[PDB]
Design a protein around this ligand. Sequence first.
Ligand SMILES: NC(=O)CC[C@H](N)C(=O)O
Length: 235
Amino acid sequence: HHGENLYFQGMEGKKYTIGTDLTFAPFEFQDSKGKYIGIDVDLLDAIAKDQDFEVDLKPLGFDSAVQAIQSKQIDGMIAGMSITDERKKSFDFSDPYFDSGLQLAVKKGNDKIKSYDDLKGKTVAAKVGTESANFLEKNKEKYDYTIKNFDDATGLYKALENGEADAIVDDYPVLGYAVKNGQKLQLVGDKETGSSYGFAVKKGQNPELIKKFNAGLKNLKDNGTYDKILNNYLA
Ligand SMILES: NC(=O)CC[C@H](N)C(=O)O
C-alpha cells in the first residue's frame, strides 16, 4: 500500500498539437483570410467540441507532419492520411473516415496521354512521402517513366505547366475537387490503390486522443453531422 487517489480528476480540455497538410482541398485548405477550412478541419473541430478537447492546428505539409509525429513534435495529425499496413508499424490510426485512392492526371488538352501505357518516356510527379509517391516507385519500370517528387501541392501542380512533369498522381477525391475548381487538369484512368483515411498518432502514444476521435466520429455519423460536413464540400 503505497498510496492511491480515490477521486480521479479528469484530463478534460487538453490541448493537442495537430499537424496537417498545407493545402489538400477539400480536406484542408485556407479561406481568403488564411483560416484553415475543409472536411478534415471541420470533422476534427466538431469531434473536439463533442469530446471536450482543444486543437492547436500546425500546417506543416504531409511528409513534414509524418516526420513531426515520429519525432514527437506534435501529438496527432489529420491530413487525408491513408491507413496502410506499413504505416501501422509506426502509427496508430483512428477508425476510417473517408474512402479514397489514387488518380493519374495530366494538363488539360494533353491528348498524348490517355492511359498508363502512354507514360513511356514521360516524367511523372508526386508529393514526397505519400501513397502517390510510393505508387510511382512501384510502377516506374512497369510503365517506363522518370519520377519527380515535390514537397507539397504547390510544386506538384505547377509541374504540369512549367515543363517539369507530363503527369502527376494525387489522391482521387482531391483531383476530382480540383477539376471542379476549374484547374487545367485531365484525369487519366480510374482509381488505383484504394485506401481509407484515418487520424494518426505515433504508435504507442496518445491513446486517449485516438479513443476520443473514434467516439466523436461515431457520434457525428449517428447525428448526421458527418454527412452534412461532407456534403458542404462535395455536393
Ligand atoms: N495529404 C496527402 O497528400 C496525403 C496523401 C495520401 N492519402 C497519403 O496518405 O499518403
